[PDB]
Amino acid sequence: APLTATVDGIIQPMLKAYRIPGMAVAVLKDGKAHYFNYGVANRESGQRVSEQTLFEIGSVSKTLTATLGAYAAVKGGFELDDKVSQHAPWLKGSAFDGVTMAELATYSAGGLPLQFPDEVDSNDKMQTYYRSWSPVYPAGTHRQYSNPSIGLFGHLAANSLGQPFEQLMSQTLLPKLGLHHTYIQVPESAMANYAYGYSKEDKPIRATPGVLAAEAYGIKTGSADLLKFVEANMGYQGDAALKSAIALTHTGFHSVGEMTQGLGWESYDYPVTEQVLLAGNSPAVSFQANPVTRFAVPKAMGEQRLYNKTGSTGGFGAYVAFVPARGIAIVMLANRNYPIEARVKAAHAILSQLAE
Ligand SMILES: *[B]([O])([O])[C]([N]C(=O)[C]C1=[C][C]=[C]S1)C1=[C]C(C([O])=O)=[C][C]=[C]1
Ligand SMILES: [Zn+2]
Ligand SMILES: [Zn+2]
Numbered sequence: 001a002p003l004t005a006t007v008d009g010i011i012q013p014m015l016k017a018y019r020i021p022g023m024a025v026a027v028l029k030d031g032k033a034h035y036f037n038y039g040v041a042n043r044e045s046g047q048r049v050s051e052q053t054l055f056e057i058g059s060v061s062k063t064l065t066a067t068l069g070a071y072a073a074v075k076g077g078f079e080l081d082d083k084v085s086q087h088a089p090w091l092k093g094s095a096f097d098g099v100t101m102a103e104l105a106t107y108s109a110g111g112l113p114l115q116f117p118d119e120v121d122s123n124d125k126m127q128t129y130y131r132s133w134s135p136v137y138p139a140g141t142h143r144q145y146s147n148p149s150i151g152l153f154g155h156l157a158a159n160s161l162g163q164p165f166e167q168l169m170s171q172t173l174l175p176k177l178g179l180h181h182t183y184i185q186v187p188e189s190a191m192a193n194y195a196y197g198y199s200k201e202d203k204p205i206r207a208t209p210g211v212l213a214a215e216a217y218g219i220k221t222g223s224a225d226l227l228k229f230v231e232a233n234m235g236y237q238g239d240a241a242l243k244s245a246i247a248l249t250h251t252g253f254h255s256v257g258e259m260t261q262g263l264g265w266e267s268y269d270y271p272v273t274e275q276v277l278l279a280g281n282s283p284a285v286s287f288q289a290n291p292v293t294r295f296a297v298p299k300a301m302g303e304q305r306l307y308n309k310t311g312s313t314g315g316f317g318a319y320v321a322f323v324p325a326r327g328i329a330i331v332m333l334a335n336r337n338y339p340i341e342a343r344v345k346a347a348h349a350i351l352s353q354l355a356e
Protein backbone atom coordinates (compact mmCIF):
# COMPACT_ATOMS: atom_id res chain seq x y z
CA ALA A 1 0.00 0.00 0.00
CA PRO A 2 0.92 3.74 -0.15
CA LEU A 3 3.36 4.90 2.49
CA THR A 4 1.47 7.79 4.07
CA ALA A 5 -1.70 5.74 4.47
CA THR A 6 0.30 2.87 5.92
CA VAL A 7 2.02 5.02 8.52
CA ASP A 8 -1.00 7.16 9.42
CA GLY A 9 -3.27 4.13 9.74
CA ILE A 10 -0.96 2.54 12.31
CA ILE A 11 0.31 5.64 14.15
CA GLN A 12 -2.78 7.79 14.54
CA PRO A 13 -4.91 5.28 16.46
CA MET A 14 -2.01 4.60 18.79
CA LEU A 15 -1.46 8.30 19.49
CA LYS A 16 -5.15 8.61 20.37
CA ALA A 17 -5.17 5.45 22.49
CA TYR A 18 -2.20 6.50 24.61
CA ARG A 19 -2.93 10.24 24.56
CA ILE A 20 0.50 10.89 23.06
CA PRO A 21 0.79 14.65 22.48
CA GLY A 22 3.32 14.47 19.64
CA MET A 23 5.34 11.99 17.61
CA ALA A 24 7.98 12.30 14.91
CA VAL A 25 8.22 9.20 12.70
CA ALA A 26 10.93 8.74 10.13
CA VAL A 27 11.13 5.84 7.66
CA LEU A 28 13.85 4.71 5.35
CA LYS A 29 12.72 3.02 2.16
CA ASP A 30 14.25 2.83 -1.31
CA GLY A 31 17.28 4.79 -0.16
CA LYS A 32 15.16 7.77 0.86
CA ALA A 33 14.09 9.31 4.16
CA HIS A 34 10.38 10.06 4.71
CA TYR A 35 8.98 12.07 7.61
CA PHE A 36 5.57 11.76 9.23
CA ASN A 37 4.88 14.28 12.00
CA TYR A 38 1.94 14.25 14.40
CA GLY A 39 0.70 16.57 17.08
CA VAL A 40 2.56 18.94 19.34
CA ALA A 41 5.98 19.28 20.90
CA ASN A 42 4.61 21.59 23.62
CA ARG A 43 0.97 21.40 24.66
CA GLU A 44 0.96 24.86 26.17
CA SER A 45 2.39 26.72 23.14
CA GLY A 46 0.94 24.41 20.51
CA GLN A 47 4.28 24.15 18.70
CA ARG A 48 3.95 21.40 16.13
CA VAL A 49 6.24 18.38 15.89
CA SER A 50 8.62 18.22 12.93
CA GLU A 51 11.59 16.06 12.08
CA GLN A 52 13.67 18.86 13.64
CA THR A 53 11.91 18.67 16.99
CA LEU A 54 14.29 17.47 19.77
CA PHE A 55 13.00 14.54 21.80
CA GLU A 56 14.70 12.70 24.64
CA ILE A 57 15.54 9.30 23.18
CA GLY A 58 16.38 7.65 26.50
CA SER A 59 18.15 4.35 26.15
CA VAL A 60 18.36 4.63 22.37
CA SER A 61 21.36 6.68 23.49
CA LYS A 62 23.10 3.40 24.29
CA THR A 63 23.55 2.78 20.56
CA LEU A 64 25.51 6.02 20.23
CA THR A 65 27.49 5.22 23.41
CA ALA A 66 28.24 1.81 21.99
CA THR A 67 29.41 3.34 18.70
CA LEU A 68 31.70 5.72 20.66
CA GLY A 69 33.07 2.75 22.60
CA ALA A 70 33.68 0.76 19.46
CA TYR A 71 35.39 3.77 17.87
CA ALA A 72 37.72 4.06 20.84
CA ALA A 73 38.54 0.37 20.51
CA VAL A 74 39.28 0.71 16.80
CA LYS A 75 41.54 3.68 17.55
CA GLY A 76 43.51 1.55 20.00
CA GLY A 77 42.22 2.76 23.35
CA PHE A 78 41.35 -0.74 24.45
CA GLU A 79 40.50 -4.22 23.22
CA LEU A 80 37.03 -5.56 23.97
CA ASP A 81 38.45 -8.63 25.72
CA ASP A 82 40.65 -6.50 28.04
CA LYS A 83 39.80 -6.57 31.72
CA VAL A 84 37.95 -3.47 32.84
CA SER A 85 40.60 -2.59 35.44
CA GLN A 86 43.26 -2.40 32.71
CA HIS A 87 41.33 0.77 31.75
CA ALA A 88 40.38 2.02 35.20
CA PRO A 89 43.36 2.18 37.56
CA TRP A 90 40.97 2.87 40.41
CA LEU A 91 39.36 -0.51 39.80
CA LYS A 92 42.62 -2.51 40.04
CA GLY A 93 42.15 -5.12 42.73
CA SER A 94 38.33 -5.05 42.49
CA ALA A 95 35.91 -7.53 40.86
CA PHE A 96 36.56 -5.66 37.63
CA ASP A 97 39.89 -7.44 37.40
CA GLY A 98 37.69 -10.36 36.23
CA VAL A 99 35.23 -8.56 33.89
CA THR A 100 35.94 -7.60 30.27
CA MET A 101 35.08 -4.36 28.50
CA ALA A 102 32.74 -6.37 26.20
CA GLU A 103 30.93 -7.84 29.23
CA LEU A 104 30.45 -4.38 30.63
CA ALA A 105 29.06 -3.18 27.31
CA THR A 106 26.68 -6.13 26.94
CA TYR A 107 25.28 -6.20 30.49
CA SER A 108 27.02 -9.49 31.32
CA ALA A 109 29.52 -8.41 34.00
CA GLY A 110 27.66 -10.42 36.65
CA GLY A 111 24.55 -8.67 37.92
CA LEU A 112 25.13 -4.96 37.88
CA PRO A 113 21.66 -3.53 38.49
CA LEU A 114 19.17 -1.69 36.28
CA GLN A 115 19.95 1.63 38.06
CA PHE A 116 22.55 2.92 40.45
CA PRO A 117 21.44 2.50 44.07
CA ASP A 118 19.80 5.75 45.18
CA GLU A 119 22.70 7.52 46.89
CA VAL A 120 25.34 6.43 44.40
CA ASP A 121 24.94 9.89 42.98
CA SER A 122 28.34 11.55 42.82
CA ASN A 123 31.56 10.64 40.96
CA ASP A 124 33.32 9.83 44.24
CA LYS A 125 30.46 7.56 45.36
CA MET A 126 30.26 5.99 41.90
CA GLN A 127 33.92 4.99 42.16
CA THR A 128 33.43 3.59 45.61
CA TYR A 129 30.33 1.72 44.40
CA TYR A 130 32.16 -0.09 41.57
CA ARG A 131 35.28 -0.70 43.68
CA SER A 132 33.17 -2.42 46.37
CA TRP A 133 30.71 -4.20 44.12
CA SER A 134 30.28 -7.92 44.74
CA PRO A 135 29.36 -9.99 41.66
CA VAL A 136 26.04 -11.82 41.73
CA TYR A 137 26.91 -14.18 38.82
CA PRO A 138 30.17 -15.27 37.19
CA ALA A 139 31.28 -12.89 34.43
CA GLY A 140 29.82 -13.58 31.01
CA THR A 141 27.07 -15.92 32.19
CA HIS A 142 24.07 -13.67 32.74
CA ARG A 143 22.57 -10.69 30.99
CA GLN A 144 21.04 -8.11 33.32
CA TYR A 145 20.16 -4.94 31.47
CA SER A 146 21.92 -2.15 33.37
CA ASN A 147 22.61 1.54 33.19
CA PRO A 148 25.66 1.24 35.45
CA SER A 149 27.11 -1.44 33.17
CA ILE A 150 27.00 0.26 29.79
CA GLY A 151 27.45 3.63 31.44
CA LEU A 152 30.82 2.65 32.82
CA PHE A 153 31.74 1.16 29.44
CA GLY A 154 31.13 4.49 27.71
CA HIS A 155 32.91 6.49 30.39
CA LEU A 156 35.97 4.28 30.35
CA ALA A 157 36.03 4.03 26.54
CA ALA A 158 36.18 7.83 26.25
CA ASN A 159 38.87 8.01 28.92
CA SER A 160 40.94 5.52 26.97
CA LEU A 161 41.38 8.26 24.34
CA GLY A 162 42.10 10.87 26.97
CA GLN A 163 38.75 12.69 26.91
CA PRO A 164 35.56 13.01 28.86
CA PHE A 165 32.60 11.21 27.30
CA GLU A 166 30.69 14.41 26.48
CA GLN A 167 33.66 15.88 24.65
CA LEU A 168 34.44 12.77 22.57
CA MET A 169 30.71 12.40 21.72
CA SER A 170 30.08 16.03 20.82
CA GLN A 171 33.38 16.92 19.12
CA THR A 172 34.29 13.69 17.40
CA LEU A 173 31.58 11.04 17.12
CA LEU A 174 28.49 13.11 16.32
CA PRO A 175 30.24 15.37 13.81
CA LYS A 176 31.86 12.43 12.04
CA LEU A 177 28.44 10.74 11.74
CA GLY A 178 27.07 14.03 10.35
CA LEU A 179 24.70 14.57 13.29
CA HIS A 180 24.80 18.31 13.86
CA HIS A 181 21.42 18.71 15.58
CA THR A 182 22.02 15.95 18.29
CA TYR A 183 23.03 16.82 21.87
CA ILE A 184 23.80 15.59 25.34
CA GLN A 185 23.02 19.08 26.69
CA VAL A 186 20.73 21.09 24.50
CA PRO A 187 22.34 24.52 23.96
CA GLU A 188 20.34 27.73 24.31
CA SER A 189 20.38 28.21 20.56
CA ALA A 190 18.45 24.93 20.06
CA MET A 191 16.09 25.25 23.01
CA ALA A 192 13.25 26.47 20.79
CA ASN A 193 13.19 23.02 19.16
CA TYR A 194 13.20 21.04 22.41
CA ALA A 195 9.89 19.32 23.16
CA TYR A 196 8.47 18.85 26.60
CA GLY A 197 7.65 15.34 27.77
CA TYR A 198 4.36 14.59 29.53
CA SER A 199 3.96 12.63 32.74
CA LYS A 200 1.06 10.32 33.55
CA GLU A 201 -0.53 13.40 35.16
CA ASP A 202 -0.02 15.37 31.94
CA LYS A 203 2.54 17.69 33.44
CA PRO A 204 5.43 18.92 31.28
CA ILE A 205 8.74 17.28 32.27
CA ARG A 206 12.28 16.85 31.01
CA ALA A 207 15.16 14.56 31.81
CA THR A 208 16.62 14.11 35.26
CA PRO A 209 20.38 14.75 35.50
CA GLY A 210 22.35 11.87 37.03
CA VAL A 211 25.52 9.80 37.23
CA LEU A 212 26.42 8.44 33.78
CA ALA A 213 23.11 9.72 32.44
CA ALA A 214 24.81 11.01 29.29
CA GLU A 215 26.20 7.55 28.50
CA ALA A 216 23.08 5.58 29.41
CA TYR A 217 20.06 7.64 28.39
CA GLY A 218 21.01 11.29 27.78
CA ILE A 219 20.77 12.14 24.08
CA LYS A 220 18.27 14.64 22.68
CA THR A 221 17.71 14.52 18.92
CA GLY A 222 15.05 14.66 16.20
CA SER A 223 13.86 12.03 13.85
CA ALA A 224 15.91 13.27 10.93
CA ASP A 225 19.25 13.10 12.75
CA LEU A 226 18.39 9.77 14.28
CA LEU A 227 17.43 8.31 10.93
CA LYS A 228 20.75 9.60 9.57
CA PHE A 229 22.51 7.52 12.27
CA VAL A 230 20.40 4.52 11.22
CA GLU A 231 21.43 5.15 7.61
CA ALA A 232 25.06 4.93 8.71
CA ASN A 233 24.20 1.52 10.16
CA MET A 234 22.75 0.41 6.79
CA GLY A 235 25.92 1.15 4.81
CA TYR A 236 28.38 3.89 5.79
CA GLN A 237 31.24 5.07 3.66
CA GLY A 238 33.89 7.43 4.82
CA ASP A 239 36.14 7.33 7.84
CA ALA A 240 37.51 3.77 7.91
CA ALA A 241 37.67 3.82 11.70
CA LEU A 242 34.03 4.89 12.04
CA LYS A 243 33.04 2.26 9.47
CA SER A 244 34.82 -0.39 11.59
CA ALA A 245 33.24 0.97 14.72
CA ILE A 246 29.73 0.64 13.33
CA ALA A 247 30.56 -2.91 12.20
CA LEU A 248 31.60 -3.80 15.71
CA THR A 249 28.20 -2.64 16.95
CA HIS A 250 26.70 -5.35 14.67
CA THR A 251 28.79 -8.03 16.36
CA GLY A 252 26.90 -10.41 18.61
CA PHE A 253 28.36 -11.43 21.98
CA HIS A 254 25.68 -13.75 23.41
CA SER A 255 21.98 -14.40 23.03
CA VAL A 256 18.91 -14.58 25.25
CA GLY A 257 16.30 -16.62 23.47
CA GLU A 258 15.86 -15.20 19.99
CA MET A 259 17.60 -11.86 20.79
CA THR A 260 21.34 -11.43 20.16
CA GLN A 261 23.11 -8.77 22.21
CA GLY A 262 25.49 -6.48 20.34
CA LEU A 263 27.12 -3.27 21.42
CA GLY A 264 24.03 -1.12 22.00
CA TRP A 265 21.98 -2.76 19.26
CA GLU A 266 19.89 -5.89 20.01
CA SER A 267 19.00 -8.03 16.98
CA TYR A 268 16.86 -10.83 15.64
CA ASP A 269 17.11 -13.20 12.69
CA TYR A 270 15.00 -11.79 9.87
CA PRO A 271 12.15 -12.31 9.12
CA VAL A 272 11.00 -11.97 12.74
CA THR A 273 7.47 -12.35 14.06
CA GLU A 274 5.68 -9.78 16.15
CA GLN A 275 5.53 -12.28 19.01
CA VAL A 276 9.29 -12.83 19.03
CA LEU A 277 10.07 -9.11 18.77
CA LEU A 278 7.70 -8.38 21.64
CA ALA A 279 9.19 -11.09 23.83
CA GLY A 280 12.75 -9.87 23.29
CA ASN A 281 11.64 -6.38 24.39
CA SER A 282 9.50 -7.52 27.30
CA PRO A 283 10.21 -7.29 31.01
CA ALA A 284 11.19 -10.95 31.18
CA VAL A 285 14.26 -9.95 29.15
CA SER A 286 14.70 -6.30 30.15
CA PHE A 287 14.07 -6.24 33.93
CA GLN A 288 15.46 -9.51 35.24
CA ALA A 289 18.70 -11.41 34.91
CA ASN A 290 18.69 -14.16 32.30
CA PRO A 291 21.35 -16.85 31.73
CA VAL A 292 22.85 -16.29 28.29
CA THR A 293 23.57 -18.61 25.43
CA ARG A 294 27.31 -18.10 25.22
CA PHE A 295 29.05 -17.70 21.87
CA ALA A 296 32.35 -19.49 21.25
CA VAL A 297 33.64 -16.21 19.78
CA PRO A 298 31.89 -12.90 19.04
CA LYS A 299 30.09 -13.13 15.67
CA ALA A 300 29.40 -10.59 12.92
CA MET A 301 25.58 -10.72 12.73
CA GLY A 302 25.27 -9.42 9.19
CA GLU A 303 22.54 -7.90 7.09
CA GLN A 304 19.62 -10.38 7.35
CA ARG A 305 18.70 -9.15 10.80
CA LEU A 306 16.31 -6.76 12.43
CA TYR A 307 18.37 -4.52 14.68
CA ASN A 308 16.53 -2.44 17.33
CA LYS A 309 16.66 -0.44 20.50
CA THR A 310 13.98 0.87 22.87
CA GLY A 311 14.43 3.94 25.00
CA SER A 312 12.53 6.12 27.44
CA THR A 313 12.79 8.93 29.96
CA GLY A 314 10.08 10.06 32.38
CA GLY A 315 8.29 12.07 29.70
CA PHE A 316 9.42 10.42 26.44
CA GLY A 317 9.24 7.14 24.53
CA ALA A 318 11.44 6.20 21.57
CA TYR A 319 11.99 3.16 19.37
CA VAL A 320 14.24 2.41 16.41
CA ALA A 321 14.43 -0.68 14.20
CA PHE A 322 16.17 -1.41 10.91
CA VAL A 323 16.69 -4.32 8.52
CA PRO A 324 19.83 -3.79 6.38
CA ALA A 325 19.15 -6.51 3.81
CA ARG A 326 15.74 -4.99 2.97
CA GLY A 327 16.81 -1.34 3.04
CA ILE A 328 14.08 -0.39 5.52
CA ALA A 329 14.05 1.34 8.90
CA ILE A 330 11.80 3.18 11.28
CA VAL A 331 12.37 5.81 13.99
CA MET A 332 9.49 6.74 16.33
CA LEU A 333 10.06 9.56 18.85
CA ALA A 334 7.22 10.54 21.24
CA ASN A 335 6.80 12.94 24.12
CA ARG A 336 5.03 10.46 26.35
CA ASN A 337 6.67 7.33 27.86
CA TYR A 338 3.98 4.95 26.51
CA PRO A 339 4.22 1.14 26.58
CA ILE A 340 7.05 -0.55 24.75
CA GLU A 341 4.65 -3.21 23.48
CA ALA A 342 2.75 -0.54 21.56
CA ARG A 343 5.94 0.83 20.08
CA VAL A 344 7.00 -2.59 18.90
CA LYS A 345 3.62 -3.60 17.50
CA ALA A 346 3.35 -0.38 15.51
CA ALA A 347 6.92 -0.57 14.18
CA HIS A 348 6.59 -4.21 13.23
CA ALA A 349 3.33 -3.49 11.38
CA ILE A 350 4.93 -0.69 9.44
CA LEU A 351 8.14 -2.53 8.63
CA SER A 352 6.18 -5.59 7.48
CA GLN A 353 4.25 -3.40 5.01
CA LEU A 354 7.51 -1.70 3.86
CA ALA A 355 8.95 -5.10 2.91
CA GLU A 356 5.95 -6.33 0.71
B1 LIG B 1 16.44 2.90 28.89
O1 LIG B 1 16.22 1.46 28.75
O2 LIG B 1 15.28 3.60 28.30
C1 LIG B 1 16.64 3.33 30.41
N1 LIG B 1 16.22 4.72 30.68
C2 LIG B 1 16.37 5.40 31.82
O3 LIG B 1 16.94 4.91 32.82
C3 LIG B 1 15.75 6.80 31.84
C4 LIG B 1 14.38 6.81 32.49
C5 LIG B 1 13.87 7.67 33.49
C6 LIG B 1 12.54 7.43 33.78
C7 LIG B 1 11.92 6.45 33.07
S1 LIG B 1 13.07 5.79 31.96
C8 LIG B 1 15.97 2.41 31.39
C9 LIG B 1 14.60 2.42 31.52
C10 LIG B 1 13.99 1.53 32.41
C11 LIG B 1 12.50 1.58 32.48
O4 LIG B 1 11.79 1.99 31.42
O5 LIG B 1 11.87 1.08 33.64
C12 LIG B 1 14.78 0.65 33.19
C13 LIG B 1 16.14 0.63 33.06
C14 LIG B 1 16.73 1.51 32.16
ZN1 LIG C 1 8.96 10.67 1.04
ZN1 LIG D 1 22.73 12.05 47.21
Ligand SMILES: [Zn+2]
Pocket residue numbers: 155165212215
Ligand atom coordinates in the same frame (compact mmCIF):
# COMPACT_ATOMS: atom_id res chain seq x y z
ZN1 LIG E 1 31.20 10.04 32.16
Ligand SMILES: [Zn+2]
Pocket residue numbers: 155159
Ligand atom coordinates in the same frame (compact mmCIF):
# COMPACT_ATOMS: atom_id res chain seq x y z
ZN1 LIG F 1 36.29 8.29 35.45
Ligand SMILES: [Zn+2]
Pocket residue numbers: 175179180
Ligand atom coordinates in the same frame (compact mmCIF):
# COMPACT_ATOMS: atom_id res chain seq x y z
ZN1 LIG G 1 28.55 20.06 13.88
